[PDB]
Design a protein. Structure first.
Length: 188
């Protein structure tokens, strides 16, 4: 087969029922996640190759960065609750990995204030039970596969993308192979 388990993807021993059609996991501490966002635009390119209206979900993980890593999972829940993911993803990546100006929960909050979220609105969201529930959903999704590496993408809770077996000499060909694989898996 042109696509095979062990090469472009692997199959989960215990499939997850009720899973989103496309589920991505990342960490703001994760260097490959940085590239997936800022230089490869993986999520955008996968969306372009999937039918209109397909649900793509993206969750943050706790297992990198200790205390701040957990704070960033809660900040990501705030971003999802307010619908401001596109405004804060790049400044959070750059604050953690480029300028190294994110050292505390207050520094995370500053990124949202700078992106135009009002302080009263961020603080209300941060402390909300809606956001606590979103934190729990992110943790449970990772726990379902005891996820220990990012970036990770799962299709229909059955197939895991395997980018390690993908040619990296050309960044655009890599993105195309990744997206075409997601499309193949979604049609399985």
């Amino acid at each position: 087969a042109q696509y095979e388990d062990g090469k472009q993807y692997t199959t989960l021993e215990k499939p997850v029922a009720g899973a989103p059609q496309v589920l991505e996991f990342f960490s703001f501490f994760c260097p490959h996640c940085y590239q997936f966002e800022e230089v490869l635009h993986i999520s955008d390119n996968v969306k372009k190759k999937l039918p209109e209206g397909v649900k793509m979900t993206k969750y943050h993980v706790n297992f990198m960065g200790g205390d701040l890593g957990k704070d960033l999972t809660q900040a990501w829940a705030v971003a999802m609750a307010l619908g401001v993911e596109d405004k804060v993803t790049v400044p959070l990546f750059e604050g953690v990995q480029k300028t190294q100006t994110i050292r505390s929960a207050s520094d995370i909050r500053d990124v949202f204030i700078n992106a135009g979220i009002k302080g009263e609105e961020y603080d209300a969201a941060w402390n909300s039970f809606v956001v606590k529930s979103l934190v729990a959903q992110q943790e449970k999704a990772a726990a379902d596969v005891q996820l220990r590496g990012v970036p990770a993408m799962f299709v229909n809770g059955k197939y895991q993308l395997n980018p390690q077996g993908m040619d990296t000499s050309n960044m655009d060909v890599f993105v195309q192979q990744y997206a075409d694989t997601v499309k193949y898996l979604s049609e399985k």
